[PDB]
Amino acid sequence: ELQKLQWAKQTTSICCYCAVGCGLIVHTAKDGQGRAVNVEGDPDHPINEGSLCPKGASIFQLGENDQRGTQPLYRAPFSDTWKPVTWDFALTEIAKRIKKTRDASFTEKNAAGDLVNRTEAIASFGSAAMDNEECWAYGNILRSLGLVYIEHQARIXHSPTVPALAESFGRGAMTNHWNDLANSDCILIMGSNAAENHPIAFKWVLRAKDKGATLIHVDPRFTRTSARCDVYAPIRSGADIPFLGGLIKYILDNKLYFTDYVREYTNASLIVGEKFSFKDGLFSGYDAANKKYDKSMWAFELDANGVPKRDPALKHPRCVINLLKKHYERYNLDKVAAITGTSKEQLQQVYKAYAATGKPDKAGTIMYAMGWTQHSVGVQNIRAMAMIQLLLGNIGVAGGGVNALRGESNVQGSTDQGLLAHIWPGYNPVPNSKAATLELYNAATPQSKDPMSVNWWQNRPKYVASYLKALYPDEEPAAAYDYLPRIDAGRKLTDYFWLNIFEKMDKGEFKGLFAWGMNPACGGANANKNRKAMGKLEWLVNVNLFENETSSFWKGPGMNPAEIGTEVFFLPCCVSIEKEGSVANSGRWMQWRYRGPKPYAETKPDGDIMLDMFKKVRELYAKEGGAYPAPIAKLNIADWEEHNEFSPTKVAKLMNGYFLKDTEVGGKQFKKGQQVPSFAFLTADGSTCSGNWLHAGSFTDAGNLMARRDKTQTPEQARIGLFPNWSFCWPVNRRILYNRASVDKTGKPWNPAKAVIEWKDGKWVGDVVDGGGDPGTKHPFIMQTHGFGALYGPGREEGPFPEHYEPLECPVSKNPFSKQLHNPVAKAVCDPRYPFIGTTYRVTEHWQTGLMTRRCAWLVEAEPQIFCEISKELAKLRGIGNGDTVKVSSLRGALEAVAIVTERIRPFKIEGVDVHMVGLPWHYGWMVPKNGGDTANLLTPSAGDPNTGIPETKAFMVDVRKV
Amino acid sequence: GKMFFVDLSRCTACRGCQIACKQWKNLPAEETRNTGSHQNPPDLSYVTLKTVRFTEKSRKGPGIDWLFFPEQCRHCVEPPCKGQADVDLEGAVVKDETTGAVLFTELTAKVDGESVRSACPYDIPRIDPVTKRLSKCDMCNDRVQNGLLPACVKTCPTGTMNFGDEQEMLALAEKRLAEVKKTYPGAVLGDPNDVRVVYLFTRDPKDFYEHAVA
Ligand SMILES: Nc1nc2c(c(=O)[nH]1)N[C@H]1C(S)=C(S)[C@@H](COP(=O)(O)OP(=O)(O)OC[C@H]3O[C@@H](n4cnc5c(=O)[nH]c(N)nc54)[C@H](O)[C@@H]3O)O[C@H]1N2
Ligand SMILES: Nc1nc2c(c(=O)[nH]1)N[C@H]1C(S)=C(S)[C@@H](COP(=O)(O)OP(=O)(O)OC[C@H]3O[C@@H](n4cnc5c(=O)[nH]c(N)nc54)[C@H](O)[C@@H]3O)O[C@H]1N2
Ligand code: SF4
Ligand code: SF4
Ligand code: SF4
Ligand code: SF4
Ligand SMILES: [S]
Ligand SMILES: [W+6]
């Protein structure tokens, strides 16, 4: 026996940091009645096999931390001190602010007199760090108060990824999952530093290499990832589309594509209309006045029925594949090598290695996380990755896919719960002011006349109806639909997003902000502006684990409390290991975790804080009246609690959904109160509720499938590592999306050695088939209207094919592909005093703003201070020696950092001038620790991209001086 | 008894091993400053039994050779640290019959602190300037004696850290050297016949650390 663990209750948990979703075992003293005594990895967990990176390994020090918030705190306007106060004070006083601001600000109709039923006087930030059930509860609480300005972390990686992959495949999700990396024959890591930012991923990446895979890292910098890849190819910032386009030309010219896959599973054969053209770097239908495209000019030629025309012979010169060939012929090795800064021989090597996976029995995968996919053609950058994978038949297959790595442990789940301004849960859109009725809302869903096209999104009315029943089960959906707020149809969608919330704050157009499990004082670009702008708030509610740069902006650097009138409530939430719930990892694995210790001090689970707070707002409206009470009054919250408090189990079950009455549906009988087995069995007619149609299948009558810890596998499952009985992923436990593309029209795998699915005994074996139906009877991309993987994607703002537009404004004046330099649908100053390219990125040991990891002594030990990584070339020119203090400055601000001089940074040749990049972590902040440094977001512009609502953090102009 | 095989050709310098050592023994963190390196703590100490050392070696063509060395006691088959301490007092340094663990006891407060360090070919032992106790990697011997992996081994996601019977580990170390050579032709084993912590180096062990090998 080990004395340490001897008298402790052992529970299981999931890591609270990155979306790899590593298993933990927690040991809690007094057999559960006191504090955690140990936290380490869960050896039975199939992703991490008990391994943890230093962030997971430090979770004991995060939990049992004397610097954690103990009780609610209050800061009175113009005070320079916190007043500790009771939960009951803080929550009653917060509910009053909400009601006051809502009553005062509530709009029943916009200027056009259309029904909106909202308040624009309160914005919410957060959070990818809450449990799925807390995320879902939160988004419905805010919308019952009529908020529209609801955002979080996801915005920065959603705006690019989801439209790109949704355009290409029908969903925006990471196509495969972490264990599947081990099945790849070529792994290309481009816009990711996964050995630092998804460390346990490298278990399976190296297992791939053990089976003969080539590992390719493409990055401006040589990182800890580069150290362990077979090929490190440097690339100048923003040169990705050139690189990806050069690879497309390589694949087409060398005929290395998967011919049968392309012909039948991609839109390669669809005929594009005669209106489609591209010339001088502009697509047809360009409106130079408004810098907008008339996408209607990119439509397909339709047959009599309204189905796009096809030439399966791929002869017709207006076939997608023939237009594609013609489009990328300009991207030869010499131009691409010139602009990327990658040698002609090193490009040829990387292209040959990766295009080799066009073999039916070889699979290549692309991993990217944030990289530089923030600019106005990041969506196009990822589009090109999808098109390469479609050409090589790498989509739907083991060791293939676009592995768009999610960031935070539950950013996947928090996005699924519609904590972005534009989505309800389950990726149903927030209605605009022009969707007067529920029926009009439903009328927008695109329909198909192809009988071989599943076009699954036609089921939406069932999902919207069930979602509205889950909130308002007394009322009819059509009627309940008038409760939740709508956004102005005559208005730019980005007007509601992350970056414009900071604009509206600094214009004082917000009374109240919830900063709920976020640290925007550090996470926001141009921190100096964001901190000033927080003064123009009337009240602030910060919910977090510790006092922080957002809770305590009022006593920040160069701030005077006396002059700042913002009423701040700080509410301390409990840590991941002190509550029960589910988090959805990058692979869509929805994982249940348990409480170890009771919440520290007077800290509450977020679920309890938000439910208690809403309970006060409710009883206040019930006794005072005020603006449109029905949506608050009528909100079903009794389904969210047992024994006076928030019940993760019950919220989870409501999210799955149940029958409100006995129903025949699917051709099966169901009794009232039965849990809904799957989204296949939801209804549009009020028979069924379901908080999120993606969760239908997750908590059935069989029990909580997310809580399964069962490693049972058939030989065919275990060979590729599906673990179908370990927890549950959406949709309906399909672990590899688009898996119908992995077999031919007889249902035989392209690669039987790594089969995902297979037709045997007249059914699909292995993974859960992504779309019902016999082999060769349905198109494989079931969420696509046409049912095909899109090479040509005419839903994209910048054009149906990705095209190089220079993301670096300042140091580049030549585009070797067209006479269109910058994005034709998109004003940096480029002050010569700031001649170097600033870039921010992460280290393995710290998390986000560092709010969490700057409180963990062991992580501060390994990475105590903000640093500045520079080449020897720049170090020499600026007279900087390794370890020297340096000042890094820009038009937006200045900071001090310890110099790291290393060959891991190198100059890029841009138009015959050496261009120097300086690298900073954004992990640091003024509150902790002593001498840590402040956020590298003092230097970043609030000038983010107009075609996204996303900031510039990978390329901003700076100077670096020795101090 | 038991042997660690550490394949440095798979190390990402994630430093899970470093934190996992402190979490398990509840060791305090040092006072650190960045002085132009990711490496921290800068050296082994009384309260740090393991730190990952970082060296950058230049190479023709893009990038560098970035060498990583998670340093710990070698648990030598014939411990020079025992031989040295047995001069002043037996029991200050003992061996575990079954596992191979060389273990410092409370009675290192009696021996000459600096004597026992000098005797150590890998420069491993560290003194508490207050109590005079010597500290180092104890092999998580209590964990091992209970049939658990040492913390640093369990936490390692890359396949760098490997643990078990000296027979199995020397078989693994030999088979893996043959595989790793195909990529890194200069790959060698750190004193395979003297120690119970066998590092695979992708090149000259001296490039990793002054005292990487004896
Ligand atoms: N340790 C740790 N892990 C984390 C996080 C953390 O803070 N710390 N955060 C999590 C979150 S929220 C996210 S979004 C993910 C993000 O994970 P990543 O995207 O991997 O994060 P970064 O290190 O910011 O950027 C990745 C790499 O992109 C490179 N890069 C920069 N510019 C370009 C360019 O123009 N082209 C290309 N091809 N590459 C470029 C950088 O040099 C860097 O190595 O990580 C998650 N994991
Ligand atoms: N310069 C620069 N800026 C960046 C980036 C960059 O690369 N460079 N990255 C951007 C990206 S990709 C992202 S995602 C954002 C992230 O930026 P933020 O979301 O502001 O990040 P943090 O708040 O530091 O990290 C997540 C928060 O979750 C909180 N948390 C943890 N557990 C819980 C819990 O149980 N409940 C609650 N309520 N809170 C909890 C932590 O305390 C922490 O405050 O930053 C962006 N900012
Ligand atoms: S931070 Fe990510 S890789 Fe590290 S232990 Fe946690 S979940 Fe796993
Ligand atoms: S845990 Fe493993 S991969 Fe990470 S630094 Fe230690 S030895 Fe290297
Ligand atoms: S490495 Fe040094 S301290 Fe460890 S057993 Fe050998 S001589 Fe003793
Ligand atoms: S074996 Fe135990 S004591 Fe030794 S370095 Fe590893 S974790 Fe630390
Ligand atoms: S994220
Ligand atoms: W992120």
JSON list of N, CA, C and O in Angstrom, two decimals, chain A residues 22 41 68 99 143 248 264 279 393 415 459 498 569 655 663 690 789 808 816 842 877:
[
{"chain": "A", "resi": 22, "resn": "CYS", "atom": "N", "xyz": [-7.48, 14.01, -22.30]},
{"chain": "A", "resi": 22, "resn": "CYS", "atom": "CA", "xyz": [-6.77, 13.02, -21.46]},
{"chain": "A", "resi": 22, "resn": "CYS", "atom": "C", "xyz": [-7.57, 12.62, -20.20]},
{"chain": "A", "resi": 22, "resn": "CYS", "atom": "O", "xyz": [-8.15, 13.50, -19.52]},
{"chain": "A", "resi": 41, "resn": "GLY", "atom": "N", "xyz": [-2.51, 10.67, -14.38]},
{"chain": "A", "resi": 41, "resn": "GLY", "atom": "CA", "xyz": [-3.22, 10.11, -15.54]},
{"chain": "A", "resi": 41, "resn": "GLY", "atom": "C", "xyz": [-3.98, 8.84, -15.22]},
{"chain": "A", "resi": 41, "resn": "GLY", "atom": "O", "xyz": [-3.61, 8.13, -14.27]},
{"chain": "A", "resi": 68, "resn": "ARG", "atom": "N", "xyz": [-6.58, 30.63, -4.69]},
{"chain": "A", "resi": 68, "resn": "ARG", "atom": "CA", "xyz": [-7.92, 30.52, -5.33]},
{"chain": "A", "resi": 68, "resn": "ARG", "atom": "C", "xyz": [-8.91, 31.46, -4.63]},
{"chain": "A", "resi": 68, "resn": "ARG", "atom": "O", "xyz": [-8.84, 31.60, -3.42]},
{"chain": "A", "resi": 99, "resn": "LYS", "atom": "N", "xyz": [-32.00, 42.97, -14.51]},
{"chain": "A", "resi": 99, "resn": "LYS", "atom": "CA", "xyz": [-33.41, 43.41, -14.69]},
{"chain": "A", "resi": 99, "resn": "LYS", "atom": "C", "xyz": [-33.43, 44.90, -15.06]},
{"chain": "A", "resi": 99, "resn": "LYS", "atom": "O", "xyz": [-34.12, 45.26, -16.04]},
{"chain": "A", "resi": 143, "resn": "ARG", "atom": "N", "xyz": [-30.33, 34.03, -23.53]},
{"chain": "A", "resi": 143, "resn": "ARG", "atom": "CA", "xyz": [-31.31, 34.25, -24.63]},
{"chain": "A", "resi": 143, "resn": "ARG", "atom": "C", "xyz": [-32.71, 34.46, -24.04]},
{"chain": "A", "resi": 143, "resn": "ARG", "atom": "O", "xyz": [-33.51, 35.15, -24.69]},
{"chain": "A", "resi": 248, "resn": "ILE", "atom": "N", "xyz": [-1.53, 21.26, -55.10]},
{"chain": "A", "resi": 248, "resn": "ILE", "atom": "CA", "xyz": [-2.69, 20.86, -55.95]},
{"chain": "A", "resi": 248, "resn": "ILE", "atom": "C", "xyz": [-2.22, 20.67, -57.41]},
{"chain": "A", "resi": 248, "resn": "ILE", "atom": "O", "xyz": [-2.58, 19.65, -58.04]},
{"chain": "A", "resi": 264, "resn": "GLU", "atom": "N", "xyz": [-16.48, 9.99, -58.20]},
{"chain": "A", "resi": 264, "resn": "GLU", "atom": "CA", "xyz": [-17.82, 9.59, -57.68]},
{"chain": "A", "resi": 264, "resn": "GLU", "atom": "C", "xyz": [-18.16, 10.27, -56.34]},
{"chain": "A", "resi": 264, "resn": "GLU", "atom": "O", "xyz": [-19.36, 10.36, -56.04]},
{"chain": "A", "resi": 279, "resn": "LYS", "atom": "N", "xyz": [-10.04, 35.89, -63.78]},
{"chain": "A", "resi": 279, "resn": "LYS", "atom": "CA", "xyz": [-9.12, 36.68, -64.65]},
{"chain": "A", "resi": 279, "resn": "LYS", "atom": "C", "xyz": [-8.51, 37.79, -63.79]},
{"chain": "A", "resi": 279, "resn": "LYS", "atom": "O", "xyz": [-9.26, 38.38, -62.98]},
{"chain": "A", "resi": 393, "resn": "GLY", "atom": "N", "xyz": [-8.28, 11.15, -51.90]},
{"chain": "A", "resi": 393, "resn": "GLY", "atom": "CA", "xyz": [-9.19, 10.18, -51.26]},
{"chain": "A", "resi": 393, "resn": "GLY", "atom": "C", "xyz": [-8.88, 9.95, -49.78]},
{"chain": "A", "resi": 393, "resn": "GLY", "atom": "O", "xyz": [-9.16, 8.83, -49.27]},
{"chain": "A", "resi": 415, "resn": "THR", "atom": "N", "xyz": [-19.24, 25.47, -28.33]},
{"chain": "A", "resi": 415, "resn": "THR", "atom": "CA", "xyz": [-19.69, 25.89, -29.68]},
{"chain": "A", "resi": 415, "resn": "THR", "atom": "C", "xyz": [-20.97, 25.11, -30.06]},
{"chain": "A", "resi": 415, "resn": "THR", "atom": "O", "xyz": [-21.90, 25.73, -30.63]},
{"chain": "A", "resi": 459, "resn": "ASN", "atom": "N", "xyz": [-33.98, 17.89, -42.01]},
{"chain": "A", "resi": 459, "resn": "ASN", "atom": "CA", "xyz": [-34.61, 17.44, -40.73]},
{"chain": "A", "resi": 459, "resn": "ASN", "atom": "C", "xyz": [-34.69, 18.58, -39.71]},
{"chain": "A", "resi": 459, "resn": "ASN", "atom": "O", "xyz": [-35.33, 18.37, -38.67]},
{"chain": "A", "resi": 498, "resn": "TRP", "atom": "N", "xyz": [-17.17, 38.90, -31.39]},
{"chain": "A", "resi": 498, "resn": "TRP", "atom": "CA", "xyz": [-15.98, 39.16, -30.53]},
{"chain": "A", "resi": 498, "resn": "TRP", "atom": "C", "xyz": [-15.45, 40.59, -30.72]},
{"chain": "A", "resi": 498, "resn": "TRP", "atom": "O", "xyz": [-15.54, 41.38, -29.78]},
{"chain": "A", "resi": 569, "resn": "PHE", "atom": "N", "xyz": [-18.56, 42.61, -9.64]},
{"chain": "A", "resi": 569, "resn": "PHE", "atom": "CA", "xyz": [-18.73, 41.38, -8.82]},
{"chain": "A", "resi": 569, "resn": "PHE", "atom": "C", "xyz": [-17.76, 40.32, -9.34]},
{"chain": "A", "resi": 569, "resn": "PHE", "atom": "O", "xyz": [-17.78, 39.99, -10.54]},
{"chain": "A", "resi": 655, "resn": "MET", "atom": "N", "xyz": [-30.91, 17.58, -22.69]},
{"chain": "A", "resi": 655, "resn": "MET", "atom": "CA", "xyz": [-30.11, 17.84, -23.92]},
{"chain": "A", "resi": 655, "resn": "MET", "atom": "C", "xyz": [-30.28, 16.63, -24.85]},
{"chain": "A", "resi": 655, "resn": "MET", "atom": "O", "xyz": [-30.56, 16.85, -26.06]},
{"chain": "A", "resi": 663, "resn": "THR", "atom": "N", "xyz": [-45.62, 8.28, -28.68]},
{"chain": "A", "resi": 663, "resn": "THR", "atom": "CA", "xyz": [-45.46, 8.62, -30.11]},
{"chain": "A", "resi": 663, "resn": "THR", "atom": "C", "xyz": [-45.01, 7.39, -30.90]},
{"chain": "A", "resi": 663, "resn": "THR", "atom": "O", "xyz": [-44.11, 6.67, -30.41]},
{"chain": "A", "resi": 690, "resn": "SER", "atom": "N", "xyz": [-35.55, 18.09, -27.04]},
{"chain": "A", "resi": 690, "resn": "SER", "atom": "CA", "xyz": [-34.10, 17.78, -27.13]},
{"chain": "A", "resi": 690, "resn": "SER", "atom": "C", "xyz": [-33.33, 19.11, -27.15]},
{"chain": "A", "resi": 690, "resn": "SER", "atom": "O", "xyz": [-33.42, 19.84, -28.17]},
{"chain": "A", "resi": 789, "resn": "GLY", "atom": "N", "xyz": [-18.19, 15.84, -51.79]},
{"chain": "A", "resi": 789, "resn": "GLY", "atom": "CA", "xyz": [-17.06, 16.63, -51.27]},
{"chain": "A", "resi": 789, "resn": "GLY", "atom": "C", "xyz": [-16.74, 17.73, -52.26]},
{"chain": "A", "resi": 789, "resn": "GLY", "atom": "O", "xyz": [-16.43, 17.38, -53.42]},
{"chain": "A", "resi": 808, "resn": "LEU", "atom": "N", "xyz": [0.33, 39.57, -45.51]},
{"chain": "A", "resi": 808, "resn": "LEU", "atom": "CA", "xyz": [1.29, 40.56, -44.97]},
{"chain": "A", "resi": 808, "resn": "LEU", "atom": "C", "xyz": [1.16, 41.86, -45.77]},
{"chain": "A", "resi": 808, "resn": "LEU", "atom": "O", "xyz": [1.65, 41.90, -46.92]},
{"chain": "A", "resi": 816, "resn": "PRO", "atom": "N", "xyz": [3.03, 37.25, -57.25]},
{"chain": "A", "resi": 816, "resn": "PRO", "atom": "CA", "xyz": [3.39, 36.57, -58.50]},
{"chain": "A", "resi": 816, "resn": "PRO", "atom": "C", "xyz": [2.29, 35.72, -59.15]},
{"chain": "A", "resi": 816, "resn": "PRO", "atom": "O", "xyz": [2.61, 35.01, -60.08]},
{"chain": "A", "resi": 842, "resn": "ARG", "atom": "N", "xyz": [2.43, 29.87, -28.34]},
{"chain": "A", "resi": 842, "resn": "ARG", "atom": "CA", "xyz": [2.28, 29.22, -27.02]},
{"chain": "A", "resi": 842, "resn": "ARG", "atom": "C", "xyz": [3.53, 28.41, -26.75]},
{"chain": "A", "resi": 842, "resn": "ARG", "atom": "O", "xyz": [4.20, 28.03, -27.75]},
{"chain": "A", "resi": 877, "resn": "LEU", "atom": "N", "xyz": [22.20, 42.73, -35.47]},
{"chain": "A", "resi": 877, "resn": "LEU", "atom": "CA", "xyz": [21.82, 44.06, -36.02]},
{"chain": "A", "resi": 877, "resn": "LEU", "atom": "C", "xyz": [21.37, 45.00, -34.89]},
{"chain": "A", "resi": 877, "resn": "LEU", "atom": "O", "xyz": [21.65, 46.21, -35.00]}
]
